C-alpha cells in the first residue's frame, strides 16, 4: 500500500517522477498480462501403466512449434473432439504409430 | 532538403539520419520511392443500397512501408561494419522509431521488419562497398504521433473537483489516459464530443462515469484506447472486475476540446490525477487543424 | 453470439470460464447501447503452423446457445442422439407378451 | 462364403511384417465363449492349397492369404488413409424385459 | 513494387493458386470435429 | 512537446568481482598511474584466491 | 560435335542420326533448346517443422521432353517421304529409343509421343521442303539406361552356393532381376546396403529370403523393381501366391557392391541361376561413380 | 574479392572454391544474382486489431537458394569431367556444406538439391566447353552455422558440481545438447534467460531440472531442440518414461550467458558431462552484437 | 478491347477473384433453408 | 516454351478456369452414391 | 575418398550385454517362438547377477 504521499516522498517531491513510477508499475502489470495471454501451450502425452497398475505414466511432450496444427474446444456440458496434427518424423507421432 | 529530416532510432538505440541535414553521416542514405509512408491506409465499407451502395464506415489499415536505403563507405571493411550496424538496428519482435521532423514538429512512427531485408546487388557487395538494402517494414499502429500532452492535478481535500483543458489538434481521434491515485472514488468524463457512433451524440455530451472505490495502495491507470484493458491497478488487484460492465466509450474527436471535469470523493489523504492526451496524426507533417 | 478474440486483452479460461455470464455488444445501428448477456458456452483454441496459412494460437468464443442458429449437421446429430436414447428407453420399457 | 477364414481350425494371418511375411494365428475362446483372443502358431505347418499349384490361378484362398500391398518411395499404389483406433467400452449391458 | 503484383494478389486472396479438394476436406474435417462426439454409438 | 524532462527512476544495482581470470578486465578503469597500472597476484604460497 | 552423338530408333526400327557425326544423313537434324533431356526431374518433399520445413523425401518424375527436329531435302517429293518416315517412326502406345553416345558409352531413353506433333511453318511445307517438327515426347521411365550386366551360375549338385559380384556404378539405385530354374529351393540375397528406408539398414545388412519350393517345370523370374510383380512362373503357376506375403525390399544403392550369395537346395537335377543388374543413370553422360 | 570466399564441400567430400581467392581452380565459378543467400527468410504473423492488424509473432522459413555456377575448361573432355564431378558433389537425400569466409570468420550452410539442376545452353555443351548450371538448393535449417562449442567435465567423486561457461554471440536463440554418462542422478540448468514464452520469464531465471536416476549403462543424450526427443538412452531404455511430465523448455537467448550449474549425485564411479552449444547466425557474415 | 481480356474473364467465370468461404456458406445457407422447417423440434 | 506458361498452370491445377458449382455438385453426387443405398425407405 | 574415410562395412565391431537391469533390450530379436519368449531370471537365491 504505497500511498501517494509516500510515492511523492520517494520521488523527492516530483509529481512527474511519481506518476512515471506509477505508470511503470501499470505497464509491468499489463506486460505480465500480455505474456500470460501469449504464453505457449504445454502438450503432453501420458499412457497407462504397462504392468496394469494405477497412475498415468508420462510418455512425452509435443512442442507447439513442432505441431502442424491443433484445435481444442471447451464446451458447456457437451463432449468435444481435440485434433492435433504432427509430422510423422515426430517422436510422439512415431510412438503413437 | 532542409525542409524535411528523416531519422531512424533502432531497437539498439542507434541513431541514423537517412534524409535531411546531416544525412549519410552514418553511412546510410534513403533512396527515392518510399511507399505507404505519408497517408495512413484506410479502407471504406459499403452496403448494397437502392442507388447502388451506401457508405457503411471506415477502417484504418496497418502500414506496409517498402523503402530502400543505400549503405556506403570508402573501404569494404568499414562498409561491412556499416551494413552490420544497419542490420542490428532492425528486428521483427521489437519496433524501431522512424522520426520525421519538419516545420510542423517531429512525429515518429514505430516500425518493425515485416520480412527479411533484401541486401546488395547481383555481385558481391565488397566490390562496390556501396549497396542498397530493400526493407519491408510495417507499422501496426499506423498513425504518426508526437509526445502526448500531460497534465497533473493533485489535491489534499477529501472532496474536490478540477477541469482539464483538452483539445485535439490532429486529424484523427485520440484516446485519453488517466493515472489516478488511491484511496478515493473518481468521477471521470467520457464526453461524446457530439460523436454519433452509438447514436447517443448529444445524449452523451456531458457523460461522466464513476470508477470503483479504490482501496489503499490501488493506484490505477485508466486507458481508453481499445488496444489495452481500461482499468489496471499497480498492485495487481482486479479493479475492472468491480466496475460492473462500465467503460470509457468515446475518444477525443478532432477539432474538439473543452474543460473536462474530474471529481474526487471519499479520499481521506487527498489524491492526485494525471491526464495524458495523445497527439496522433495520419501524416508525417500537416498544418494544425481548427 | 460468436466472437473471435484476436489480440484482445481478454484471457479465456482466466478472465472468463465456461458457463460464466458475460456481456457482448455488436456495432449495429439500433443495438449499439444494448449488451447481450449470455453464459459462455464454447471456446475453442486453434492454431496452424503450416507454411501456406499460418494462424497463431487464437480463441473463438460462443456465448449463449440457440437451436435455431445451430448448423443443420449439428442439429441432425443432436436429434439423432436424442432419438437413439429415447428408442433405447422405449425398447427397455417394452412389456413382454 | 467364408473368405476371412478367421474362425477356422487352422486359423489365418492376422498380422505380419515385410521382412518375415505373414504370421498365423488361431482364435482361442475364453470362459463363456464371449471373448476370443489370438494365439500364434509357433510352428506353422499348414499345407498350401491345391489351387496354388494350378496354371492360370490368381485368386486368394481363404486359408492362405498371400497379397501384401507395399508402400515405399517407389510404391506402385497411392495410400490415402491408414487409421487405427483402440477399443472403447470394457463392458456391455444387453437386456430389458425377460 | 509490391503494390500491383503478386503481393497484392495475396491481398486479393485465393484468386491464383488455391485448390478445391483440400478446402472441401478441411470443411468436412471441421464439421466432423463438431459433430462426431455427439453422434450415438449405436 | 514534453512538459518536463525528469531523470529516469534508476533502480537499485549490484556488481561483483572475484579476479579469477587472467588479466584485470575493462570493468576496472585505472586512474592516476594511467592504463596498465593494475594486475592480478596469485598468492599461491598461502593457497588463496588471486587478488587485485 | 564429335564428342556427342544422338540417335532415334523408331517403333518400326528406323535409324536416325539427329546430332553428332553423320547427322542429317536421313534428312532430319536436331534443333537447339531441348528441355528435360539431361537431368531426371525430381521433386523433393517437405513437412512443417519448428525451423521452417523438414525434409520429407524425394520422388522422381516422368520426363516431358519438348524438342524440335528439322526435316529437309532438295525436292518436295523426297521431303514429303522424309517427313512421312519421321512421323511413322513415332507412336503414342509404343515407345521408341533415343540413344546418346559419348566417351562414357551409349545410354538410351525410351520415349513416346505425349501429344500430336506440331509440324511445318505458317505456309505450306512444300515451298521450302525444309520444315521444323516440334515433338513433345515423354519418358515414363525417366532414367537413362545402359545394357544390363548379366551373370549365370549353373550347378549339377543337389545343394550348392555361389557368390555374384555386384556393384552399382551409377547415381541411382537399381533393382535386381533373377531367373531361377526349377525344381529347387532357392535362397536369394536382399541386402540393405545400409539403406535406412525401412529403419533397418544395419539389421538387414545380410538379409536373405527363401523362395517357395519350386515344382518341376516352374522356372521363375524374380524382378525386384516395383513396376512388376516380383515372382512370375514360366508355366503360369502362382508362385508369389504360395510365397506367404514375403518380398524383395531393397535396391542396390549407388556406390555399393559385394559378392551376394545365392543358395540352392533340394534340386535333384541341379539348377541354374541368372542375375541381371540394370545400369540406370540420371544423365545421358556421366563419369563413373565410386 | 579477397573480402569474401565461398566454398562448397560436396556430399562426396569434394572441395570447390566458387568465389574469392582461388576461385575457378576446380573449373567451376559462381555467377552473379544468387537469391535468399544472405538473410534468413522470416515471415511475421499478423492478427486483426483495433487499428488494423496486430503483430502475432514470427516464423522462420527454410531457405530456397537459387544460384548459378559456370563449369569451364579448355577442352570438352576435361569440361565433361568437371561437370560430372560438380554434379556428383550434390544430392537430394544427403546435404552438402556451403561455407562463407570473411573477416567475421567462417560460417556454413547445409544445403541439398531441391530439384533437378538445369545445365548447359540451348546447343550441346561440348561446343563451348564452358556452360552454366542453374542450381536450386534448399536449406532445411535456414541459419548459417559455425562449429559448435563443446565442453567436457569429468569427475570421479560420487557428488560433484560444475559451472559451464555459456554465451550466445549469435542473433538467434540456440538449443543446448548434453551427453551424460551413467549411473548417477543429474541436475541440469534450464534457465529462462528472461524468455517469457511460458509466462515464467522471471520465475524460471534460475531453473534447474532433475533427470531420472540412470542405471548402469544407460548413458543419455539430452537435446533441448524441438526437432529431437529430449531424452534418448543409448541402450534403448525408455528413460523419458520415468521423468514425470517434465522437460527442457528454454533455448539460450541471444546476448545472454553465464556459468550454468550442472550437478551430479549418487554416482558410484563418477561421471562425465558434455555440453554442446551451437553457434547459429542469420547472415553469412555480421559484426558481433551485444 | 473487351474481347480477350478481363471482359472475357468475366465470361470465363470465377477464374480470377473468387473465394471458397462465402460459396460454401451460401451452399450451407441454401441447404439450411431447404431442411430447417422439416427438422423436428425435439 | 511449355515450362513457365499455361502448360505449368496445368501443373499448378485449378488456379485458372475452374468453377465451384461443378465441384460442389460432384462432391454431393459422390456422397449421395455412398449414402443413398443405405438410407431407409421409410 | 576411399582412402580418407572408413566405410561402415570396413569396421570391426564389438557388442556387450549384461542383463543387470533385468531388461532384454531391443538388440535381442527372438527367433522361432516370436515375441515374449525371452526373459530375465534374477537368481537371487545365490549371490549372482541376473541371467537371460
CB G128 within 8 A of CB G233: no
G41 in Cβ contact with G62 (< 8 Å): yes
* Cβ–Cβ contact F11 with A under 8 A: no
Q: How far apart are CA H243 and CA B21, in angstroms?
A: 63
Question: To 10 degrees, the CA torsion angle through C75, C78, C81, C82?
Answer: -100
- Measured N-to-C along each axis, helices E20-35 and I20-35 cross at an angle, to the nearest 10 degrees, of 50
Alpha-carbon torsion angle C10, C14, C19, C23, nearest 10:
-30
First to last CA, chain E: 60
Cα separations in angstroms, F17 against F32, F42, F51, F52: 21, 15, 10, 10
**Residue C63: closest CA among A75, A37, I9:** A75
C-alpha to C-alpha distance for C83 and C89, rounded to whole angstroms: 10
Q: Is there a contact between G40 and G119 (Cβ–Cβ < 8 Å)?
A: no
Instruction: At G178, list the grid cell.
Output: 533373377
Q: How many CA atoms lie within 13 A of B45 on its CB side?
A: 7
**How far apart are alpha carbons E40 and E31 in whole angstroms?**
16
Residue C75 CA from chain centroid, whole number: 13
- CB pairs < 8 Å spanning B and C: 14
Do residues H235 and H214 lie in contact, with contact meaning Cβ atoms separated by under 8 Å?
no
Question: Which subunits count as partners of chain G given 3+ CB pairs below 8 Å?
Answer: A, C, D, H, J, K
Q: Which of B207, B148, B215 lies closest to B178 in space, CA to CA?
A: B148
User: What CA–CA distance (Å, rounded) separates H143 from H109?
Assistant: 7
Distance to chain K for D87, nearest Cα, Å = 23
Compute CA G143 distance to the chain's CA centroid, rounded to the nearest angstrom. Answer: 6
Name the residue in chain I with its Cα closest to that of E11.
I17
First to last CA, chain J: 60
Total beta-carbon pairs less than 8 A apart between chain E and chain I: 14
Question: By CA distance, what is C53's nearest residue in H?
Answer: H45
Chains D and G touch, using 3 or more CB pairs below 8 Å = yes
Q: Please report how the helices J20-35 and E20-35 are oriented relative to each other, as an axis angle in degrees rounded to 10.
A: 50
Short-list G28, G118, G137, CA closest to G72: G28
Closest-approach residue (CA) in chain B for F4:
B150
Q: Which residues of E make CB contacts under 8 Å with I? A: 12-15, 18, 20, 23, 27
CB-based contacts of J8-13 (< 8 A; 24+ apart in sequence): J12/E17, J13/E17, J13/E19
Q: By the CB < 8 Å criterion, does F3 face chain B?
A: yes
Burial track B28-51 (b if 16+ CB lie within 10 A, e otherwise): bbbeeebebbeebeeeeeeeeeee
Chain C residues inside the 8 Å CB shell of G48: 49-51
Alpha-carbon gap, residue H266 to H184, rounded angstroms? 5
Residue H52 in contact with partner chain B when CB distance is under 8 A? yes
Measured between alpha carbons, how far is F1 from B105 in angstroms, rounded to an integer? 9
Q: Rounded to whole angstroms, what are the CA distances from D31 to B169, D28, D36, H26?
A: 89, 10, 9, 78
Q: Are B14 and B85 in contact (CB under 8 A)?
A: yes
CA separation for the pair C66, C89 (Å, rounded): 26
Residue with grid cell 493506484, as numbered in its chain: B219
Q: Which residues, listed in sequence order, are joined to residue F49 by a DSSP beta bridge?
A: none
HEC profile for chain C?
A: CEEEECCCCCCECCCECCCCEEEECCCCCCCCCCCEEEEEEEEEEEEECCCCCCEEEEEEEEECCCCCCCCHHHHHHHHHHHHHHHHHHHHHHCCCC
Closest Cα in chain K to D41:
K33
With an 8 Å Cβ cutoff, is A33 touching chain C?
yes
Q: Is A16 on the interface with F (CB under 8 A)?
A: yes
User: How many angstroms separate the CA of residue K49 from the nearest CA in chain D?
Assistant: 31
Tally A–H CB contacts below 8 A: 35
Cα A28-A31-A34 angle, rounded to 5 deg: 155
Measured CA to CA, the distance from residue G252 to residue I26 in angstroms comes to 56
Helix, strand, coil percentages for chain A (3-state, nearest 5): 40, 25, 35
CB under 8 Å to H258, separation ≥6 — which residues?
Answer: H165, H166, H191
- CA torsion, points B103, B109, B115, B120, in degrees to nearest 10? 30
Mutate to test the interface with C, among A41, A70, A76 (most CBs of C within 10 A): A76
Report whether B146 contacts F1 (CB < 8 A).
yes
Which residue among J15, J20, J24 places its CB closest to the CB of E16? J15
Burial class (CB in 10 A: 0-12, 13-18, 19+), C39: middle
The answer, for J2 touching chain G at a CB cutoff of 8 Å, is yes
Resolution in A: 3.3
- DSSP state, B115? B
The minimal CB distance from C81 to the residues E31, E34, E38 is found for: E38
Is residue H84 within 8 angstroms of chain G, CB to CB?
yes
Task: Provide the 3-class DSSP secondary structure of residue A9.
Answer: helix
Hey, is the C-beta of A71 within 8 angstroms of any chain C C-beta? Answer: yes
**Of G261, G262, G223, nearest in space to G239 by CA:** G223
Judging contacts by C-beta atoms under 8 Å, the chain A residues touching residue F6 are 14, 16-17, 20
Q: Rounded CA gap, I42 and I36, in Å? A: 13
CB–CB contact B199 C32 (8 Å): yes
Partner-chain residue, chosen from I16, I18, I24, that has the shortest CB–CB distance to E27 = I24
Q: Is G106 on the interface with H (CB under 8 A)?
A: no
The answer to whether B148 touches B279, Cβ cutoff 8 Å, is: yes
B221:A16 CB<8 A: no
Which residue, G19, G169, G33, is CA-closest to G99? G19
Beta carbons of B272 and A4 less than 8 Å apart:
yes
A29 vs chain C: nearest CA distance in angstroms? 12
Contact C7 H47 (CB under 8 A): yes
At least 3 CB pairs under 8 A between chains F and K: no
Query: d(Cα G52, Cα H227) in Å, to the nearest integer?
Result: 11
CB < 8 Å to G52, chain C: 51
CB contact (8 A) between residue H227 and residue G32: no
Task: Report which secondary-structure segment, H or E, holds H208.
Answer: strand H208-210
Q: Out of G33, G42, G53, whose CB is closest to H140? A: G53
Which chains lie within 8 Å of chain C at 3 or more CB pairs, if any?
A, B, D, E, G, H, I
Which of B178, B171, B148, B184 is closest to B261 using CA atoms?
A: B178
Minimal-distance CA residue of chain C relative to H47: C6
Whether H58 has its CB under 8 Å from any CB of chain C: the answer is no
Residue J22 backbone phi and psi in degrees, to 5: -70, -35
Give all chains having 3 or more CB-to-CB distances under 8 Å with chain I: C, E, J
- For helices C72-93 and E20-35, angle between their N-to-C axes, nearest 10 degrees: 40
In contact, G279 and G147? CB cutoff 8 Å: yes
Burial of B108 (C-beta count, 10 Å sphere; 0-12/13-18/19+): middle
* Interface residue K34 vs chain H (CB under 8 A): no
Cβ-contact D1, D17 below 8 angstroms: no
Residue with cell 470508477: B211
DSSP reduced 3-state for G149: strand
Q: What chains are in contact with K, requiring at least 3 Cβ pairs below 8 Å? A: D, G, H
Does E33 contact A78 at a Cβ distance shorter than 8 Å?
A: no
Beta pairing, strands G15-19 & B272-281: unpaired
> Cα(C72)–Cα(I39) distance, rounded to whole angstroms?
9
Residue A4 dihedral angles phi and psi, to the nearest 5°: -65, -40
Minimal-distance CA residue of chain F relative to B107: F1
> Any chain B CB within 8 A of the CB of A16?
yes
Whole-number Å distance between alpha carbons of B114 and G100: 50
Interface test with E, best of I14, I20, I27 (most E CBs within 10 A): I20
Could you say which of E29, E32, E37 has the minimum Cβ distance to residue A80? E37
Of H201, H226, H241, the CB nearest to A63: H226
Assess C71–I contact: CB distance below 8 Å, yes or no.
yes
Q: What angle do CA C60, C63, C66 make, to 5 degrees?
A: 115
Nearest residue in chain C measured CA to CA from A32: C9
Q: Do H55 and B112 touch (CB under 8 A)?
A: yes
H38: contact with B, CB 8 A cutoff = yes
Amino acid at each position: 500500500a504505497n500511498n501517494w504521499t509516500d510515492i511523492l516522498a520517494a520521488s523527492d517531491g516530483d509529481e512527474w517522477a511519481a506518476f512515471k513510477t506509477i505508470e511503470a508499475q501499470a505497464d509491468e502489470v499489463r506486460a505480465g498480462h500480455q505474456a500470460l495471454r501469449r504464453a505457449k501451450p504445454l502438450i503432453r502425452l501420458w499412457m497407462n501403466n504397462p504392468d496394469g497398475s494405477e497412475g498415468l505414466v508420462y510418455v512425452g511432450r509435443v512442442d507447439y512449434d513442432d505441431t502442424i496444427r491443433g484445435s481444442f474446444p471447451f464446451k458447456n456440458n457437451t463432449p468435444s473432439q481435440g485434433v492435433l496434427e504432427l509430422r510423422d518424423d515426430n517422436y510422439l507421432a512415431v510412438w503413437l504409430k | 532538403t532542409d525542409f524535411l529530416k528523416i531519422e531512424l532510432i533502432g531497437r539498439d538505440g542507434s541513431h541514423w539520419v537517412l534524409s535531411g541535414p546531416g544525412m549519410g553521416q552514418q553511412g546510410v542514405t534513403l533512396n527515392p520511392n518510399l511507399q505507404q509512408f505519408y497517408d495512413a491506409p484506410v479502407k471504406t465499407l459499403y452496403v448494397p443500397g437502392p442507388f447502388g451502395e451506401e457508405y457503411a464506415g471506415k477502417r484504418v489499415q496497418r502500414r506496409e512501408i517498402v523503402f530502400s536505403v543505400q549503405a556506403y563507405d570508402e573501404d569494404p571493411d568499414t562498409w561491412s561494419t556499416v551494413d552490420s550496424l544497419w542490420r542490428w538496428a532492425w528486428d521483427y519482435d521489437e519496433e524501431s522509431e522512424l522520426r520525421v521532423s519538419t516545420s510542423d514538429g517531429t512525429r515518429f512512427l514505430k516500425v518493425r521488419l515485416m520480412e527479411e531485408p533484401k541486401p546488395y546487388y547481383e555481385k558481391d557487395p565488397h566490390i562496390t562497398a556501396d549497396n542498397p538494402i530493400v526493407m519491408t517494414v510495417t507499422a501496426t499502429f499506423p498513425y504518426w504521433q508526437d509526445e502526448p500532452e500531460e497534465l497533473i492535478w493533485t489535491t489534499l481535500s477529501t472532496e474536490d473537483m478540477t477541469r482539464f483543458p483538452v483539445r485535439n489538434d490532429g486529424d484523427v481521434p485520440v484516446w485519453l489516459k488517466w493515472t489516478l491515485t488511491a484511496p478515493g472514488l473518481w468521477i471521470l468524463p467520457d464526453f461524446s464530443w457530439g460523436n454519433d457512433m452509438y447514436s447517443r451524440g448529444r445524449e452523451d455530451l456531458g457523460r461522466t462515469v464513476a470508477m470503483p472505490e479504490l482501496v489503499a495502495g490501488e493506484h490505477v491507470s485508466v486507458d481508453s484506447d481499445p488496444r489495452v484493458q481500461t482499468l489496471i491497478a499497480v498492485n495487481g488487484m482486479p479493479t475492472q472486475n468491480r466496475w460492473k460492465g462500465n467503460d470509457l466509450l468515446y475518444p477525443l474527436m478532432p477539432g474538439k476540446g473543452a474543460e473536462i471535469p474530474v471529481q474526487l470523493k471519499n479520499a481521506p489523504e487527498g489524491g492526485a490525477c494525471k491526464l495524458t492526451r495523445p497527439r496522433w496524426y495520419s501524416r508525417p507533417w500537416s498544418r494544425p487543424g481548427v | 453470439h460468436l466472437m473471435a478474440l484476436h489480440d484482445s486483452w481478454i484471457i479465456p479460461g482466466l478472465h472468463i470460464d465456461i458457463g460464466q455470464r458475460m456481456g457482448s455488444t455488436v456495432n449495429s445501428k439500433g443495438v449499439e447501447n444494448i449488451v447481450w448477456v449470455n453464459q459462455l458456452e464454447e471456446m475453442t483454441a486453434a492454431w496452424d503452423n503450416s507454411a501456406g496459412q499460418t494462424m497463431p494460437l487464437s480463441w473463438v468464443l460462443k456465448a449463449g446457445k440457440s437451436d435455431r442458429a445451430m448448423s443443420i449437421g449439428e442439429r441432425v446429430a443432436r436429434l439423432a442422439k436424442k432419438m437413439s436414447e429415447a428408442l433405447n428407453n422405449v425398447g427397455v420399457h417394452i412389456v413382454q407378451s | 462364403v467364408d473368405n476371412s477364414n478367421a474362425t477356422a481350425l487352422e486359423g489365418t494371418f492376422f498380422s505380419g511384417t515385410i521382412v518375415d511375411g505373414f504370421a498365423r494365428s488361431v482364435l482361442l475362446y475364453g470362459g463363456g465363449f464371449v471373448e476370443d483372443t489370438l494365439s500364434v502358431v509357433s510352428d506353422d505347418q499348414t499345407l498350401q492349397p491345391d489351387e496354388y499349384y494350378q496354371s492360370g490361378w490368381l485368386a486368394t484362398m481363404a486359408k492362405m492369404p498371400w497379397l501384401v500391398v507395399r508402400d515405399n518411395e517407389w510404391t506402385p499404389i497411392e495410400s490415402s488413409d491408414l487409421s487405427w483406433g483402440p477399443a472403447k467400452n470394457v463392458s456391455v449391458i444387453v437386456g430389458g424385459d425377460n | 513494387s509490391s503494390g500491383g503484383g503478386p503481393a497484392v494478389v495475396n491481398n486479393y486472396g485465393d484468386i491464383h493458386t488455391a485448390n478445391y479438394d483440400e478446402f472441401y476436406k478441411g470443411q468436412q474435417r471441421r464439421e466432423a470435429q463438431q459433430q462426431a462426439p455427439i453422434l450415438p454409438v449405436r | 512537446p514534453l512538459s518536463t524532462v525528469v531523470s529516469p527512476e534508476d533502480s537499485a544495482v549490484q556488481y561483483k568481482a572475484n579476479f579469477v581470470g587472467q588479466y584485470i578486465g575493462p570493468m576496472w578503469k585505472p586512474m592516476g598511474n594511467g592504463w596498465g597500472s593494475l594486475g592480478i597476484h596469485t598468492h599461491a604460497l598461502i593457497s588463496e584466491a588471486p587478488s587485485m
